[PDB]
Amino acid sequence: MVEPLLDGLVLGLVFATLGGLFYAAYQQYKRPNELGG
Amino acid sequence: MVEPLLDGLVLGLVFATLGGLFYAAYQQYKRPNELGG
Amino acid sequence: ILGAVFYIVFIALFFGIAVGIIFAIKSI
Amino acid sequence: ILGAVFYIVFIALFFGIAVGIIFAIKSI
Amino acid sequence: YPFWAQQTYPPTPREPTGRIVCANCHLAAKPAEVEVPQSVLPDTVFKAVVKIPYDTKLQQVAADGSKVGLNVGAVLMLPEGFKIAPEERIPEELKKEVGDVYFQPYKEGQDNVLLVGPLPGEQYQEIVFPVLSPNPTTDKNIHFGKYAIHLGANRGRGQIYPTGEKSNNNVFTASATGTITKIAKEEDEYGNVKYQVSIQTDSGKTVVDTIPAGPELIVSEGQAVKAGEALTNNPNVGGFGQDDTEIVLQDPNRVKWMIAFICLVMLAQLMLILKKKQVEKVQAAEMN
Amino acid sequence: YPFWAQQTYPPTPREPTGRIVCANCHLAAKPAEVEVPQSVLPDTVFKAVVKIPYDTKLQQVAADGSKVGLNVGAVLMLPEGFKIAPEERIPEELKKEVGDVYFQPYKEGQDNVLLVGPLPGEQYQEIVFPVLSPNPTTDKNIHFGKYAIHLGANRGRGQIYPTGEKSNNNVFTASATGTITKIAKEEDEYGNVKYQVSIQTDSGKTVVDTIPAGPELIVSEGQAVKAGEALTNNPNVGGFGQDDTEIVLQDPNRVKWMIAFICLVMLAQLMLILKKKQVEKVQAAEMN
Amino acid sequence: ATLKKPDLSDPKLRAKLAKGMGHNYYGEPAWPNDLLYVFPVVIMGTFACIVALSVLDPAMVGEPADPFATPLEILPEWYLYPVFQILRSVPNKLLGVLLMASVPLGLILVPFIENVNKFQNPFRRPVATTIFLFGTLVTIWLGIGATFPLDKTLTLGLF
Amino acid sequence: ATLKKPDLSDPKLRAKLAKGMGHNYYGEPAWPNDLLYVFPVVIMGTFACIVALSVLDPAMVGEPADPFATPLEILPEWYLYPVFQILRSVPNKLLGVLLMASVPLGLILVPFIENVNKFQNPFRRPVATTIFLFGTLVTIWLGIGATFPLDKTLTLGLF
Amino acid sequence: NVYDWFQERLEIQALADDVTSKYVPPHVNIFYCLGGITLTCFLIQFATGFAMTFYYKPTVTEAYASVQYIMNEVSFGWLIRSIHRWSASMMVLMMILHVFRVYLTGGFKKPRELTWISGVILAVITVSFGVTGYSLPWDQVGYWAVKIVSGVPEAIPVVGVLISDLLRGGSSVGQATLTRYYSAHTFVLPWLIAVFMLLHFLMIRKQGISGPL
Amino acid sequence: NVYDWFQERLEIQALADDVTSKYVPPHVNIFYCLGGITLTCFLIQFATGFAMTFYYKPTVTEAYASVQYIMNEVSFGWLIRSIHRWSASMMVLMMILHVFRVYLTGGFKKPRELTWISGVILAVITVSFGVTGYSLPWDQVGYWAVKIVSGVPEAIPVVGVLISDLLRGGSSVGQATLTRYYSAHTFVLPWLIAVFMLLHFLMIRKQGISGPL
Amino acid sequence: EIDVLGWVALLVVFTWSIAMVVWGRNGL
Amino acid sequence: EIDVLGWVALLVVFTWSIAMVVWGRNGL
Amino acid sequence: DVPDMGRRQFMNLLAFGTVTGVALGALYPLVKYFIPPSTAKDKLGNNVKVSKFLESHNAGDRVLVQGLKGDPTYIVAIRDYGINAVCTHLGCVVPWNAAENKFKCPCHGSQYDETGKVIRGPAPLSLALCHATVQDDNIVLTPWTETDFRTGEKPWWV
Amino acid sequence: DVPDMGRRQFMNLLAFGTVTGVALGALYPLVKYFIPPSTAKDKLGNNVKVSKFLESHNAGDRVLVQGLKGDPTYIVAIRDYGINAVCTHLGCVVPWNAAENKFKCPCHGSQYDETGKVIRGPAPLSLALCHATVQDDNIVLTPWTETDFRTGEKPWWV
Amino acid sequence: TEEMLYAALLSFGLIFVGWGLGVLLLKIQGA
């Protein structure tokens, strides 16, 4: 069957995770650290 | 139940193994090898 | 609605413990 | 009884192969 | 008519496929909705809202062909143990929302399956059910947990009577292959307006299809488009739909312990982080 | 009597516990043995030897008290499909060993359960069964595999008749508590020798226990050792015992392939050792 | 801050860095800073949420199986929504199977395609990030389409 | 003969020899002499015997279970014969249980008893070898006694 | 002493000096836990799943009634099953988020192609857990979504029907299907997923985490 | 090249140089195979045992009939079961002979006490395999020797009855017993024996074989 | 309304777990 | 008598396996 | 004097070659093992008495009966052909609509005819047919051999 | 200025102490889970009709009936007590010997009486007893509370 | 879909609430 609460938890975390990953990439894109790229 | 063929295979191998182990111990008991005891 | 009130109180109670204990451990 | 005959023949046939091949591999 | 389900299908209103047999006569299809709380406590009156929506200012075709309003009606299947709350356990604000609804059990010893209808559609767009949750403490047959609720709601008249004959709310077809000739209204004083349709030519085949008043007429004269032509259009404006939801007969003791355990986890998580903070102090004192 | 098992227990000679109901009357116990081949081929006559051993020169007590020899008798339970081989499929050397035995199925449609007895004990110390193995090719109900064979063999007379009464091959007890007085032989011409035992004193209790001829007498006079005293000794010299073995309805195709696989293993093992011998040659050339 | 700089004077570390490894030789110490103190927090947090979910929204017992009765609107679990959509939207039965098997087999080839580039940051590789975002959107689109009838599954009930 | 003498000039080997290890650094090479050529022989030999046994003496299907009917002479498998004998010969129910648990727990203590001695050869440790041979005989005696009735199980039908 | 006891035998210090020798770089954030949370969800599945093997009966005339027994009669049975359901969905979700990280951090490139490939296999295994367990309650919902996916591999021209017949143990969906599905769920896949998790983790420990962005 | 591919990632050569660096001493004779043969017998048990989980049905009204189905109707089913029986008895026998060697070669002394102890545990686990599987056909022979051993731990004064009730899932021997026994046979013990075999083998590889006599 | 606090408990423990991770490892 | 050769096959393969081990590793 | 690679790879082919043969011979029975073994049935799946079905059992006979390969088949004196219920699209059992005289699939809405022939919807093929002859007690069902007396050509099941 | 071991071991007691509490709270439901949940039954185990048993069912009633805790119990108008069949030695069900009026165990040969009282053999205790009262359809069996009217003292089951 | 979006917003939003709550705890002790 269909679980509305579950389908909501999926979308909510998927977009949060995707967003957070690009935020993590952008932060290191502008500020390169100790010998890395 | 009872398996006559199986009970025979047990005794036959048990005594053979026990006998063979003491034979293996006796052979090295009389003739010590390269730094061992 | 009521959950929003509970949620605020719930976290604040533990946040107070966090900030509370951290000063109790530091000052001792 | 008959098994004792089969047992002798059976092993001897393979023993002959063992001694047979070992000389075929050595001589080549 | 919800009681016609009882007449035709005595044991249960729901097929193994979960079809909700109302659709056997109400061939239309319009959205239906049931809204219950996500979780209720044992022995507690709660609100089960059944929505049977449609255009409030729209009329259908009656038996006389006259334009009349629509009456709504639905069947609600509650979990075992659930039933209509006693009249003295319903608050004043709830009784107001309910109205003069006649909640009717499907059969003797089945208070969890209720019938409602016909009710005035302009007034009962939604129907409020005063349900009383069962108590697993006073009943060893009822258990705490997640159960299913089924709904089948209908608007407007049906298409097929329990007898088997059709009605004047659907379309009409043709017999075989032939050309029509005469179109008039054979009306009666004890009866009503009819319409005669003739069939001719081909090989023999002379027959007449008498159709009741109500449906429109998009056929003028002289046609022979096989057998199965909709020469009457569809006068149906009603609709039957289904919906399903889940209610949780929740035990308060199970929630309380869960909260306690969640509090333990949070408190223990804090002690670990505070412990790491203590370790960070020592490590900074031995770095050089 | 093997046919008395049929009279008292029609459906099967074997209880769920596997008791072989013969023991319900033959209360004695002496060793019994069944010897069948370890494996037989389908549709093949083989020899099933049933041994019912005892002292060849020893006699029992008859109904008249007379000393007569013992007759043996047994029940053999073969796996489903097995039965007594047709008379034309039995070799001459086998028929000689069998004798004039009357193999008797337990009931209609059960040729795998056979009854034998009574047969002369001095001659039939062992009984040879001409069994024909079933064929899983011509019968889709029979399968290749290991099956069980049950045996219950008996010597000497029984102790209890099918009617329920006792016999003159077991012991006799006392009624209650009292002292005996007269011991003689009340014999008849149409009947036989009896023995009267009296009971007296205590409180009232005057009764007589009449015991048939046959059993010994180790009681002289004037005794009162409760109720249940063996004043007659045990004249039984017969015995009933059980045995169980396993026969394998072997499929020749399953053995042939197994031999082929065993030959593959041996040959492959040889090639590996010969391979190691080749490696030992190379390693000795690079040691220095 | 509890930090250890990478020792670039060790040739054995530089060799690992050249092969793209040795990144577990610098930074915060794993033990006990993370493994002993942070990891139990994560584990307990994961367990506590599932427990809380299991009490508030417990498992349901459906109706007994009926081989003579097909359910009205029967769907698989959420992670099978996009595949189920492909399965029913594609007319050719075999094509749908290939497209389904294309998902795991395609992902296996992903490293053997982006090996052209050494960049790992999504911004330094914009072609791959675009294809990823496209596929991620298509997947969600197919997934939502599984909840709608076949008549209005592609248009998603809009146009 | 394909043999490699132990390098006694390596201190790291001598240290292992002192702790009773490092005995896998000398002799015939394990690969490929044993692992690749002898091991498949052993494996195939083990499998071939079981197969041959399984064809000639295949498994039997007994009679269906009857909770109202106790089998005449019901025994466990052969390796449970000695324990089963102890279980039924000992009057006190609890004592039999202790004696049964004494077998695995006793064996656990065996290394912590013969650690007094360093000798491994049974002839250089005659006390242990005697106790072993005694126990091995007792085990077999109890095992055979399991096949006999309780009346004649201890005497083993002799005296 | 107890430490010295174990040290002389198996060199315990060699292990402790291998864990305290590993550091975690500054570019490793919170999203690097998604792999561990996926593992945590499985360990929960393993525990609760094992616990349910003590009451569940893989028979068409027993399966449904057994699940009711767990939910209604078994002490805390409702919790063990409800946890086993949520933890299952969470495992798949966390795994997908775990994939989101690996791709958006380039942790799949050289030399970790094998780690990624073994990951993809793990993903297929985890989904196989879901599909099989889905039909174990033998309810209406489970029976019909296993009757649909059973016929799916019949499109393959050569071995197609053979593949299907192996999956459901015959030409239809019955007791043979449930038996095979219960075997896959509680035996086959737990071992398969244990093997490939081991390979997954060993290759990670050997190569370490990937570089920064 | 294929070797160079794997070499750059996980250093494959480091493994090959760890196997070709190990030698077997002259005092190691034919009796040092008894441990490996015991393992070989289990691997046979694992294969054949898994295969039978595809047809066997752990229900009091299905178990017996299923075993008949395997013996009679299933292709080579008679062989898989017969092998599973003989290989079971052989495993126990080889294990006992394996113990005979270890004791009569002093391979249990320092520093291999833990190897011996984990061995004893393995022995108890292997016997537990036999007892549980023994009662799986649910025949007369199996049901009654599981009804006798079930009451044995009732002698313990404190937790005795609790221990028994856990083993047979109640106060008697019924469906609950068979269900729990099938769980132990095809889930619990296979994992337990896998863990302790791993510990057994790891300690052996770490310390090597014992000295000569 | 104990049902409300129940869901709040879920929301809080989910929030508090992220807070402790971010605080613990100074994470992002 | 194919049954006889069957048991012989078991006896032979058991004998031959020991022979190949003793021969292979020069074992004892 | 020393055997070269030509002899080393020869014995390898001999040794490891025969080992493979043993492994294959051990795998064949194991593989054939997993390949499953090869009168009408009602709800319970035992026996369908034709003397009880013809009496009182949904007048206007359109009752599902478990037939060939487990697939449920409608049984519509009696007709010669048996209309299969399993839809060709996915596998949903298609219910008979007496109000439209057409089989109408629920999951999708692809529909059929009075004989099982598809007339509309995403259904690629028609409902299967089979010999619904009556023999003794139950109803013996044999597979449809000849061509379709509905489609016009050879059936997709043959 | 720097926290000593006294403070390091204190926070350890705090941190790892509460972690244990969570683990224990998570183990308690799991443990209670494995602990199994807490009218006469015949062969099938459904219902024993007293109207059918008294008629034709082994005249000279010594028939085994599944009673308390699954253990089979003999039902011997009707008697007040119910003679348990499970032997005290191991667990073999003891058959009734009508030819000796004594229960005789098969596995061993320990024997009993007409009431279940042990008279000979390695049987440590007598056969158990229980209230064999008749109520409605079946036979309601309640555990024997009072002392034994056979042994002379308190029963071993109480 | 009432329960769906309700859960979607919460699961998304409370992450940031916890994120900020952690950062705030860092500033109190002095990161």
Added chain:
Amino acid sequence: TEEMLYAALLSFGLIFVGWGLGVLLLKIQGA
């Protein structure tokens, strides 16, 4: 017990038969 002792002797005896057979093979090649 006919099948028992029969198997006991064989299992014990054929070990030596195989043992000697292996030694004989060693002398043929020249150990």
